Amino acid sequence: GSELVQSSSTGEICNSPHQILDGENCTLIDALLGDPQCDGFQNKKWDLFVERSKAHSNCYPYDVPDYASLRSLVASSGTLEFNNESFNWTGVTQNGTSSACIRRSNNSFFSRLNWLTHLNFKYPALNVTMPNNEQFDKLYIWGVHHPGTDKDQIFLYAQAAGRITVSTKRSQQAVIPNVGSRPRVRNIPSRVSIYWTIVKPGDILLINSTGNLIAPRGYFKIRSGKSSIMRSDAPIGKCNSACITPNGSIPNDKPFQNVNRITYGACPRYSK
Ligand SMILES: *[C@@H]1O[C@H](CO)[C@@H](O)[C@H](O)[C@H]1NC(C)=O
Ligand SMILES: *[C@@H]1O[C@H](CO)[C@@H](O)[C@H](O)[C@H]1NC(C)=O
Ligand SMILES: *[C@@H]1O[C@H](CO)[C@@H](O)[C@H](O)[C@H]1NC(C)=O
Ligand SMILES: *[C@H]1O[C@H](CO)[C@@H](O)[C@H](O)[C@H]1NC(C)=O
């Protein structure tokens, strides 16, 4: 029967009763790192985050090796509560900026990251620690910088590229920066690779670096938690509905549904 299956929708997503966050030009990852279009998303919370097909990044060219996993982690958690922290950044210059990441017409950078360069032509071996003495877990986002040329590498860090090691008592992550010119993006042949690390209470964050480090300014709180993300170009209207799809919201009364596999909230079984 067809009275058991739902096939239609208004085409709109209803803004109630689930907290929906429309990304517009921004991906979740960009709102996390702090891309300048995405400054309004700071410390926002949500039950469902909606990515758009038109989304574009407009900052430093970067890649995230474990993109999906990170995008999914932060998704479930459903918060961007960030906390600034006082790292001991001695011996280095802070707040590097780029003409590729524009903010108020001035060269800037990802709001949540800290680009360290040499100070007086020295870049000491960093041995900096940040303990989690809190009750909850801390989520730290950091990166490694891959300059286009050796000339840039010496300009920025005053020595050749060496290993970056981010470890805790439970794990260790080690990256080797790779000097090499990758195709220009926003006139930038350099790249940044994004990595992440979770620190449990009583555990400690340990950073080891001789350059190429793109440092965190602090941590996000990690829930997880049942929130989510859906890729959809569907418009948003004012209404109430418990079940949302990428083709729009639908009512939750039939046992089945053939509009789309992906749903959030109290929904029918997909059938087809
Ligand atoms: C969305 O992206 C377009 C393309 O560059 C841009 O013109 C527009 O300003 C962006 N929207 C806003 C206001 O963030
Ligand atoms: C930061 O690092 C230096 C060298 O390791 C140390 O001597 C200094 O006391 C530190 N500053 C703070 C506030 O811990
Ligand atoms: C670095 O930038 C942040 C905000 O971008 C600012 O609050 C801080 O004072 C800056 N640090 C230094 C030492 O300039
Ligand atoms: C961190 O990394 C380097 C390269 O492996 C290592 O030689 C150095 O001793 C380490 N620093 C600390 C804090 O042990």
PDB file of N, CA, C and O in Angstrom, residues 12-83:
ATOM      1  N   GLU A  12      10.726  22.148   1.753  1.00  0.00           N
ATOM      2  CA  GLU A  12      11.300  23.015   2.772  1.00  0.00           C
ATOM      3  C   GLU A  12      11.718  22.201   3.990  1.00  0.00           C
ATOM      4  O   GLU A  12      11.159  21.132   4.252  1.00  0.00           O
ATOM      5  N   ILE A  13      12.705  22.704   4.722  1.00  0.00           N
ATOM      6  CA  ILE A  13      13.082  22.129   5.999  1.00  0.00           C
ATOM      7  C   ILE A  13      12.451  22.987   7.077  1.00  0.00           C
ATOM      8  O   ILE A  13      12.558  24.204   7.020  1.00  0.00           O
ATOM      9  N   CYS A  14      11.792  22.375   8.054  1.00  0.00           N
ATOM     10  CA  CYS A  14      11.157  23.159   9.114  1.00  0.00           C
ATOM     11  C   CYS A  14      12.095  23.430  10.296  1.00  0.00           C
ATOM     12  O   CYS A  14      12.758  22.533  10.819  1.00  0.00           O
ATOM     13  N   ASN A  15      12.126  24.695  10.689  1.00  0.00           N
ATOM     14  CA  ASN A  15      13.030  25.174  11.718  1.00  0.00           C
ATOM     15  C   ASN A  15      12.670  24.758  13.147  1.00  0.00           C
ATOM     16  O   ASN A  15      13.362  25.123  14.104  1.00  0.00           O
ATOM     17  N   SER A  16      11.576  24.019  13.304  1.00  0.00           N
ATOM     18  CA  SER A  16      11.181  23.553  14.629  1.00  0.00           C
ATOM     19  C   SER A  16      10.868  22.057  14.519  1.00  0.00           C
ATOM     20  O   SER A  16      10.481  21.595  13.447  1.00  0.00           O
ATOM     21  N   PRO A  17      11.056  21.290  15.614  1.00  0.00           N
ATOM     22  CA  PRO A  17      11.567  21.760  16.904  1.00  0.00           C
ATOM     23  C   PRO A  17      13.063  21.501  17.048  1.00  0.00           C
ATOM     24  O   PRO A  17      13.553  21.537  18.172  1.00  0.00           O
ATOM     25  N   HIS A  18      13.755  21.177  15.958  1.00  0.00           N
ATOM     26  CA  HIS A  18      15.198  20.924  16.022  1.00  0.00           C
ATOM     27  C   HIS A  18      16.029  22.148  15.655  1.00  0.00           C
ATOM     28  O   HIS A  18      15.746  22.817  14.664  1.00  0.00           O
ATOM     29  N   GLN A  19      17.073  22.414  16.437  1.00  0.00           N
ATOM     30  CA  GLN A  19      17.941  23.557  16.187  1.00  0.00           C
ATOM     31  C   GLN A  19      18.762  23.334  14.922  1.00  0.00           C
ATOM     32  O   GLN A  19      19.660  22.488  14.886  1.00  0.00           O
ATOM     33  N   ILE A  20      18.467  24.115  13.891  1.00  0.00           N
ATOM     34  CA  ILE A  20      19.105  23.930  12.600  1.00  0.00           C
ATOM     35  C   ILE A  20      20.050  25.104  12.324  1.00  0.00           C
ATOM     36  O   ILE A  20      19.717  26.257  12.597  1.00  0.00           O
ATOM     37  N   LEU A  21      21.234  24.809  11.795  1.00  0.00           N
ATOM     38  CA  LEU A  21      22.211  25.845  11.521  1.00  0.00           C
ATOM     39  C   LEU A  21      22.559  25.807  10.044  1.00  0.00           C
ATOM     40  O   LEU A  21      23.095  24.813   9.553  1.00  0.00           O
ATOM     41  N   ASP A  22      22.210  26.879   9.334  1.00  0.00           N
ATOM     42  CA  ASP A  22      22.449  26.970   7.896  1.00  0.00           C
ATOM     43  C   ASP A  22      23.862  27.503   7.648  1.00  0.00           C
ATOM     44  O   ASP A  22      24.179  28.635   8.021  1.00  0.00           O
ATOM     45  N   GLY A  23      24.714  26.683   7.041  1.00  0.00           N
ATOM     46  CA  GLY A  23      26.100  27.055   6.830  1.00  0.00           C
ATOM     47  C   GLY A  23      26.327  28.146   5.808  1.00  0.00           C
ATOM     48  O   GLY A  23      27.359  28.821   5.837  1.00  0.00           O
ATOM     49  N   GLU A  24      25.348  28.344   4.930  1.00  0.00           N
ATOM     50  CA  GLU A  24      25.497  29.272   3.805  1.00  0.00           C
ATOM     51  C   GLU A  24      26.814  29.029   3.030  1.00  0.00           C
ATOM     52  O   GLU A  24      26.972  27.962   2.428  1.00  0.00           O
ATOM     53  N   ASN A  25      27.735  29.999   3.000  1.00  0.00           N
ATOM     54  CA  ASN A  25      28.990  29.807   2.253  1.00  0.00           C
ATOM     55  C   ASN A  25      29.993  28.873   2.951  1.00  0.00           C
ATOM     56  O   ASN A  25      30.949  28.408   2.330  1.00  0.00           O
ATOM     57  N   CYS A  26      29.751  28.576   4.225  1.00  0.00           N
ATOM     58  CA  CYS A  26      30.713  27.831   5.039  1.00  0.00           C
ATOM     59  C   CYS A  26      30.427  26.344   5.277  1.00  0.00           C
ATOM     60  O   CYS A  26      29.302  25.939   5.543  1.00  0.00           O
ATOM     61  N   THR A  27      31.483  25.546   5.188  1.00  0.00           N
ATOM     62  CA  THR A  27      31.475  24.165   5.645  1.00  0.00           C
ATOM     63  C   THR A  27      31.657  24.114   7.152  1.00  0.00           C
ATOM     64  O   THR A  27      32.068  25.103   7.764  1.00  0.00           O
ATOM     65  N   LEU A  28      31.392  22.960   7.761  1.00  0.00           N
ATOM     66  CA  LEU A  28      31.562  22.863   9.207  1.00  0.00           C
ATOM     67  C   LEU A  28      33.023  23.025   9.579  1.00  0.00           C
ATOM     68  O   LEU A  28      33.352  23.687  10.560  1.00  0.00           O
ATOM     69  N   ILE A  29      33.891  22.435   8.769  1.00  0.00           N
ATOM     70  CA  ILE A  29      35.323  22.456   9.011  1.00  0.00           C
ATOM     71  C   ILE A  29      35.867  23.890   9.010  1.00  0.00           C
ATOM     72  O   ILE A  29      36.700  24.248   9.844  1.00  0.00           O
ATOM     73  N   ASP A  30      35.391  24.709   8.077  1.00  0.00           N
ATOM     74  CA  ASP A  30      35.785  26.112   8.023  1.00  0.00           C
ATOM     75  C   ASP A  30      35.312  26.913   9.244  1.00  0.00           C
ATOM     76  O   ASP A  30      36.031  27.782   9.743  1.00  0.00           O
ATOM     77  N   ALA A  31      34.099  26.640   9.713  1.00  0.00           N
ATOM     78  CA  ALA A  31      33.590  27.323  10.896  1.00  0.00           C
ATOM     79  C   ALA A  31      34.377  26.892  12.139  1.00  0.00           C
ATOM     80  O   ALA A  31      34.431  27.602  13.141  1.00  0.00           O
ATOM     81  N   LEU A  32      34.983  25.716  12.063  1.00  0.00           N
ATOM     82  CA  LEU A  32      35.766  25.191  13.167  1.00  0.00           C
ATOM     83  C   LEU A  32      37.116  25.906  13.210  1.00  0.00           C
ATOM     84  O   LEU A  32      37.489  26.485  14.236  1.00  0.00           O
ATOM     85  N   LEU A  33      37.840  25.858  12.092  1.00  0.00           N
ATOM     86  CA  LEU A  33      39.173  26.447  11.995  1.00  0.00           C
ATOM     87  C   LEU A  33      39.112  27.958  12.196  1.00  0.00           C
ATOM     88  O   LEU A  33      40.002  28.551  12.815  1.00  0.00           O
ATOM     89  N   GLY A  34      38.061  28.576  11.662  1.00  0.00           N
ATOM     90  CA  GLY A  34      37.862  30.005  11.817  1.00  0.00           C
ATOM     91  C   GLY A  34      38.133  30.769  10.539  1.00  0.00           C
ATOM     92  O   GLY A  34      38.852  31.772  10.545  1.00  0.00           O
ATOM     93  N   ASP A  35      37.590  30.267   9.435  1.00  0.00           N
ATOM     94  CA  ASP A  35      37.648  30.964   8.159  1.00  0.00           C
ATOM     95  C   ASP A  35      36.849  32.252   8.346  1.00  0.00           C
ATOM     96  O   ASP A  35      35.797  32.254   8.992  1.00  0.00           O
ATOM     97  N   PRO A  36      37.345  33.353   7.770  1.00  0.00           N
ATOM     98  CA  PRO A  36      36.776  34.683   8.010  1.00  0.00           C
ATOM     99  C   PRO A  36      35.308  34.905   7.597  1.00  0.00           C
ATOM    100  O   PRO A  36      34.706  35.830   8.133  1.00  0.00           O
ATOM    101  N   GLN A  37      34.736  34.086   6.714  1.00  0.00           N
ATOM    102  CA  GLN A  37      33.310  34.203   6.398  1.00  0.00           C
ATOM    103  C   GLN A  37      32.485  33.628   7.543  1.00  0.00           C
ATOM    104  O   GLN A  37      31.267  33.838   7.623  1.00  0.00           O
ATOM    105  N   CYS A  38      33.154  32.882   8.417  1.00  0.00           N
ATOM    106  CA  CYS A  38      32.474  31.959   9.320  1.00  0.00           C
ATOM    107  C   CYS A  38      32.572  32.409  10.774  1.00  0.00           C
ATOM    108  O   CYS A  38      32.370  31.612  11.700  1.00  0.00           O
ATOM    109  N   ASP A  39      32.846  33.698  10.959  1.00  0.00           N
ATOM    110  CA  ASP A  39      33.072  34.265  12.281  1.00  0.00           C
ATOM    111  C   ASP A  39      31.803  34.301  13.131  1.00  0.00           C
ATOM    112  O   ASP A  39      31.865  34.248  14.360  1.00  0.00           O
ATOM    113  N   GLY A  40      30.650  34.395  12.478  1.00  0.00           N
ATOM    114  CA  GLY A  40      29.385  34.361  13.188  1.00  0.00           C
ATOM    115  C   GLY A  40      29.037  32.994  13.771  1.00  0.00           C
ATOM    116  O   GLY A  40      28.114  32.864  14.580  1.00  0.00           O
ATOM    117  N   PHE A  41      29.774  31.965  13.375  1.00  0.00           N
ATOM    118  CA  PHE A  41      29.437  30.626  13.824  1.00  0.00           C
ATOM    119  C   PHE A  41      30.163  30.311  15.120  1.00  0.00           C
ATOM    120  O   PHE A  41      30.029  29.208  15.648  1.00  0.00           O
ATOM    121  N   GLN A  42      30.960  31.259  15.610  1.00  0.00           N
ATOM    122  CA  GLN A  42      31.771  30.999  16.794  1.00  0.00           C
ATOM    123  C   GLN A  42      30.902  30.628  17.983  1.00  0.00           C
ATOM    124  O   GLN A  42      29.916  31.296  18.274  1.00  0.00           O
ATOM    125  N   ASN A  43      31.271  29.530  18.636  1.00  0.00           N
ATOM    126  CA  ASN A  43      30.604  29.049  19.843  1.00  0.00           C
ATOM    127  C   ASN A  43      29.120  28.717  19.664  1.00  0.00           C
ATOM    128  O   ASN A  43      28.378  28.649  20.642  1.00  0.00           O
ATOM    129  N   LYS A  44      28.685  28.492  18.426  1.00  0.00           N
ATOM    130  CA  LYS A  44      27.299  28.081  18.194  1.00  0.00           C
ATOM    131  C   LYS A  44      27.060  26.607  18.549  1.00  0.00           C
ATOM    132  O   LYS A  44      27.998  25.802  18.563  1.00  0.00           O
ATOM    133  N   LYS A  45      25.804  26.270  18.843  1.00  0.00           N
ATOM    134  CA  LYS A  45      25.404  24.889  19.109  1.00  0.00           C
ATOM    135  C   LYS A  45      24.267  24.574  18.164  1.00  0.00           C
ATOM    136  O   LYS A  45      23.616  25.487  17.648  1.00  0.00           O
ATOM    137  N   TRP A  46      24.001  23.286  17.964  1.00  0.00           N
ATOM    138  CA  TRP A  46      22.967  22.869  17.027  1.00  0.00           C
ATOM    139  C   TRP A  46      22.653  21.384  17.172  1.00  0.00           C
ATOM    140  O   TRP A  46      23.495  20.596  17.612  1.00  0.00           O
ATOM    141  N   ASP A  47      21.433  21.012  16.804  1.00  0.00           N
ATOM    142  CA  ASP A  47      21.055  19.610  16.644  1.00  0.00           C
ATOM    143  C   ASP A  47      21.391  19.138  15.220  1.00  0.00           C
ATOM    144  O   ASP A  47      21.894  18.033  15.022  1.00  0.00           O
ATOM    145  N   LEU A  48      21.119  19.979  14.227  1.00  0.00           N
ATOM    146  CA  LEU A  48      21.442  19.640  12.843  1.00  0.00           C
ATOM    147  C   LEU A  48      22.119  20.793  12.076  1.00  0.00           C
ATOM    148  O   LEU A  48      21.626  21.921  12.050  1.00  0.00           O
ATOM    149  N   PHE A  49      23.264  20.490  11.472  1.00  0.00           N
ATOM    150  CA  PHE A  49      24.009  21.436  10.658  1.00  0.00           C
ATOM    151  C   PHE A  49      23.819  21.125   9.171  1.00  0.00           C
ATOM    152  O   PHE A  49      24.031  19.991   8.743  1.00  0.00           O
ATOM    153  N   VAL A  50      23.465  22.131   8.371  1.00  0.00           N
ATOM    154  CA  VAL A  50      23.172  21.898   6.952  1.00  0.00           C
ATOM    155  C   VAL A  50      24.242  22.479   6.012  1.00  0.00           C
ATOM    156  O   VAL A  50      24.349  23.692   5.887  1.00  0.00           O
ATOM    157  N   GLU A  51      25.033  21.630   5.356  1.00  0.00           N
ATOM    158  CA  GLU A  51      26.019  22.117   4.388  1.00  0.00           C
ATOM    159  C   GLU A  51      25.386  22.411   3.025  1.00  0.00           C
ATOM    160  O   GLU A  51      24.442  21.740   2.623  1.00  0.00           O
ATOM    161  N   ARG A  52      25.935  23.388   2.302  1.00  0.00           N
ATOM    162  CA  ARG A  52      25.393  23.794   1.005  1.00  0.00           C
ATOM    163  C   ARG A  52      26.399  23.501  -0.104  1.00  0.00           C
ATOM    164  O   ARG A  52      27.604  23.451   0.144  1.00  0.00           O
ATOM    165  N   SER A  53      25.905  23.298  -1.323  1.00  0.00           N
ATOM    166  CA  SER A  53      26.768  22.907  -2.440  1.00  0.00           C
ATOM    167  C   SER A  53      27.658  24.050  -2.896  1.00  0.00           C
ATOM    168  O   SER A  53      28.713  23.825  -3.492  1.00  0.00           O
ATOM    169  N   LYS A  54      27.198  25.273  -2.637  1.00  0.00           N
ATOM    170  CA  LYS A  54      27.899  26.498  -3.021  1.00  0.00           C
ATOM    171  C   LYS A  54      29.070  26.818  -2.093  1.00  0.00           C
ATOM    172  O   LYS A  54      29.821  27.757  -2.352  1.00  0.00           O
ATOM    173  N   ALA A  55      29.208  26.060  -1.007  1.00  0.00           N
ATOM    174  CA  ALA A  55      30.233  26.343  -0.003  1.00  0.00           C
ATOM    175  C   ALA A  55      31.629  26.390  -0.602  1.00  0.00           C
ATOM    176  O   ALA A  55      32.010  25.524  -1.388  1.00  0.00           O
ATOM    177  N   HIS A  56      32.380  27.422  -0.242  1.00  0.00           N
ATOM    178  CA  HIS A  56      33.743  27.561  -0.723  1.00  0.00           C
ATOM    179  C   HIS A  56      34.631  28.052   0.415  1.00  0.00           C
ATOM    180  O   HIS A  56      34.187  28.839   1.248  1.00  0.00           O
ATOM    181  N   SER A  57      35.880  27.605   0.450  1.00  0.00           N
ATOM    182  CA  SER A  57      36.815  28.089   1.456  1.00  0.00           C
ATOM    183  C   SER A  57      37.539  29.303   0.874  1.00  0.00           C
ATOM    184  O   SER A  57      37.923  29.293  -0.297  1.00  0.00           O
ATOM    185  N   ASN A  58      37.758  30.333   1.682  1.00  0.00           N
ATOM    186  CA  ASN A  58      38.407  31.534   1.169  1.00  0.00           C
ATOM    187  C   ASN A  58      39.515  32.018   2.108  1.00  0.00           C
ATOM    188  O   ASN A  58      39.556  33.192   2.494  1.00  0.00           O
ATOM    189  N   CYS A  59      40.404  31.093   2.471  1.00  0.00           N
ATOM    190  CA  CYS A  59      41.512  31.365   3.385  1.00  0.00           C
ATOM    191  C   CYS A  59      42.789  30.676   2.867  1.00  0.00           C
ATOM    192  O   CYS A  59      42.975  30.532   1.655  1.00  0.00           O
ATOM    193  N   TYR A  60      43.675  30.268   3.773  1.00  0.00           N
ATOM    194  CA  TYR A  60      44.890  29.561   3.380  1.00  0.00           C
ATOM    195  C   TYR A  60      44.549  28.180   2.792  1.00  0.00           C
ATOM    196  O   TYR A  60      43.701  27.451   3.316  1.00  0.00           O
ATOM    197  N   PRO A  61      45.219  27.813   1.700  1.00  0.00           N
ATOM    198  CA  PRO A  61      44.948  26.497   1.127  1.00  0.00           C
ATOM    199  C   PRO A  61      45.325  25.426   2.135  1.00  0.00           C
ATOM    200  O   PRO A  61      46.478  25.400   2.586  1.00  0.00           O
ATOM    201  N   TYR A  62      44.377  24.553   2.464  1.00  0.00           N
ATOM    202  CA  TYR A  62      44.619  23.513   3.451  1.00  0.00           C
ATOM    203  C   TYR A  62      43.990  22.190   3.011  1.00  0.00           C
ATOM    204  O   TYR A  62      43.111  22.168   2.152  1.00  0.00           O
ATOM    205  N   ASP A  63      44.434  21.096   3.625  1.00  0.00           N
ATOM    206  CA  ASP A  63      43.820  19.786   3.454  1.00  0.00           C
ATOM    207  C   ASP A  63      43.691  19.098   4.815  1.00  0.00           C
ATOM    208  O   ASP A  63      44.518  19.329   5.696  1.00  0.00           O
ATOM    209  N   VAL A  64      42.649  18.283   4.998  1.00  0.00           N
ATOM    210  CA  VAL A  64      42.504  17.485   6.222  1.00  0.00           C
ATOM    211  C   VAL A  64      42.513  16.000   5.854  1.00  0.00           C
ATOM    212  O   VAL A  64      41.526  15.488   5.329  1.00  0.00           O
ATOM    213  N   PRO A  65      43.639  15.312   6.121  1.00  0.00           N
ATOM    214  CA  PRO A  65      43.859  13.897   5.788  1.00  0.00           C
ATOM    215  C   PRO A  65      42.746  12.957   6.241  1.00  0.00           C
ATOM    216  O   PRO A  65      42.421  11.997   5.541  1.00  0.00           O
ATOM    217  N   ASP A  66      42.157  13.252   7.389  1.00  0.00           N
ATOM    218  CA  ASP A  66      41.067  12.451   7.926  1.00  0.00           C
ATOM    219  C   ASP A  66      39.800  13.308   8.011  1.00  0.00           C
ATOM    220  O   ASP A  66      39.120  13.352   9.042  1.00  0.00           O
ATOM    221  N   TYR A  67      39.519  14.008   6.914  1.00  0.00           N
ATOM    222  CA  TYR A  67      38.401  14.938   6.823  1.00  0.00           C
ATOM    223  C   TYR A  67      37.110  14.383   7.400  1.00  0.00           C
ATOM    224  O   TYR A  67      36.599  14.886   8.411  1.00  0.00           O
ATOM    225  N   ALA A  68      36.604  13.332   6.758  1.00  0.00           N
ATOM    226  CA  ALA A  68      35.306  12.754   7.090  1.00  0.00           C
ATOM    227  C   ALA A  68      35.165  12.452   8.579  1.00  0.00           C
ATOM    228  O   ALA A  68      34.163  12.819   9.208  1.00  0.00           O
ATOM    229  N   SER A  69      36.179  11.803   9.142  1.00  0.00           N
ATOM    230  CA  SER A  69      36.144  11.430  10.544  1.00  0.00           C
ATOM    231  C   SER A  69      35.990  12.672  11.448  1.00  0.00           C
ATOM    232  O   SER A  69      35.127  12.686  12.334  1.00  0.00           O
ATOM    233  N   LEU A  70      36.808  13.710  11.206  1.00  0.00           N
ATOM    234  CA  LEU A  70      36.714  14.995  11.929  1.00  0.00           C
ATOM    235  C   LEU A  70      35.378  15.705  11.765  1.00  0.00           C
ATOM    236  O   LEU A  70      34.792  16.170  12.750  1.00  0.00           O
ATOM    237  N   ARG A  71      34.919  15.821  10.517  1.00  0.00           N
ATOM    238  CA  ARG A  71      33.635  16.458  10.209  1.00  0.00           C
ATOM    239  C   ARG A  71      32.521  15.738  10.956  1.00  0.00           C
ATOM    240  O   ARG A  71      31.582  16.374  11.437  1.00  0.00           O
ATOM    241  N   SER A  72      32.664  14.416  11.094  1.00  0.00           N
ATOM    242  CA  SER A  72      31.654  13.577  11.743  1.00  0.00           C
ATOM    243  C   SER A  72      31.731  13.673  13.268  1.00  0.00           C
ATOM    244  O   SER A  72      30.695  13.674  13.928  1.00  0.00           O
ATOM    245  N   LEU A  73      32.947  13.667  13.820  1.00  0.00           N
ATOM    246  CA  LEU A  73      33.164  13.856  15.255  1.00  0.00           C
ATOM    247  C   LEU A  73      32.462  15.118  15.759  1.00  0.00           C
ATOM    248  O   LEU A  73      31.606  15.045  16.640  1.00  0.00           O
ATOM    249  N   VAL A  74      32.846  16.267  15.197  1.00  0.00           N
ATOM    250  CA  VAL A  74      32.319  17.579  15.600  1.00  0.00           C
ATOM    251  C   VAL A  74      30.806  17.622  15.357  1.00  0.00           C
ATOM    252  O   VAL A  74      30.054  18.274  16.075  1.00  0.00           O
ATOM    253  N   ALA A  75      30.365  16.916  14.326  1.00  0.00           N
ATOM    254  CA  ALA A  75      28.939  16.827  14.023  1.00  0.00           C
ATOM    255  C   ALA A  75      28.109  16.298  15.192  1.00  0.00           C
ATOM    256  O   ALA A  75      27.199  16.961  15.673  1.00  0.00           O
ATOM    257  N   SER A  76      28.472  15.117  15.667  1.00  0.00           N
ATOM    258  CA  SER A  76      27.792  14.447  16.763  1.00  0.00           C
ATOM    259  C   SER A  76      27.824  15.285  18.025  1.00  0.00           C
ATOM    260  O   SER A  76      26.853  15.334  18.777  1.00  0.00           O
ATOM    261  N   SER A  77      28.960  15.938  18.250  1.00  0.00           N
ATOM    262  CA  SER A  77      29.147  16.743  19.445  1.00  0.00           C
ATOM    263  C   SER A  77      28.174  17.923  19.448  1.00  0.00           C
ATOM    264  O   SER A  77      27.517  18.183  20.450  1.00  0.00           O
ATOM    265  N   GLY A  78      28.074  18.631  18.329  1.00  0.00           N
ATOM    266  CA  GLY A  78      27.060  19.663  18.199  1.00  0.00           C
ATOM    267  C   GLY A  78      27.366  20.977  18.907  1.00  0.00           C
ATOM    268  O   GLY A  78      26.443  21.685  19.315  1.00  0.00           O
ATOM    269  N   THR A  79      28.645  21.315  19.059  1.00  0.00           N
ATOM    270  CA  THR A  79      29.009  22.590  19.677  1.00  0.00           C
ATOM    271  C   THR A  79      30.322  23.122  19.122  1.00  0.00           C
ATOM    272  O   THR A  79      31.172  22.358  18.667  1.00  0.00           O
ATOM    273  N   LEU A  80      30.474  24.443  19.151  1.00  0.00           N
ATOM    274  CA  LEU A  80      31.741  25.081  18.805  1.00  0.00           C
ATOM    275  C   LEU A  80      32.307  25.868  19.980  1.00  0.00           C
ATOM    276  O   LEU A  80      33.117  26.776  19.780  1.00  0.00           O
ATOM    277  N   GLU A  81      31.861  25.551  21.195  1.00  0.00           N
ATOM    278  CA  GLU A  81      32.426  26.191  22.373  1.00  0.00           C
ATOM    279  C   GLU A  81      33.923  26.006  22.348  1.00  0.00           C
ATOM    280  O   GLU A  81      34.415  24.884  22.442  1.00  0.00           O
ATOM    281  N   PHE A  82      34.635  27.120  22.197  1.00  0.00           N
ATOM    282  CA  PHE A  82      36.086  27.126  22.144  1.00  0.00           C
ATOM    283  C   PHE A  82      36.593  27.810  23.398  1.00  0.00           C
ATOM    284  O   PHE A  82      35.947  28.712  23.914  1.00  0.00           O
ATOM    285  N   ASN A  83      37.745  27.386  23.897  1.00  0.00           N
ATOM    286  CA  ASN A  83      38.330  28.055  25.053  1.00  0.00           C
ATOM    287  C   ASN A  83      39.776  28.455  24.801  1.00  0.00           C
ATOM    288  O   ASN A  83      40.617  27.596  24.523  1.00  0.00           O
TER     289      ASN A  83
END
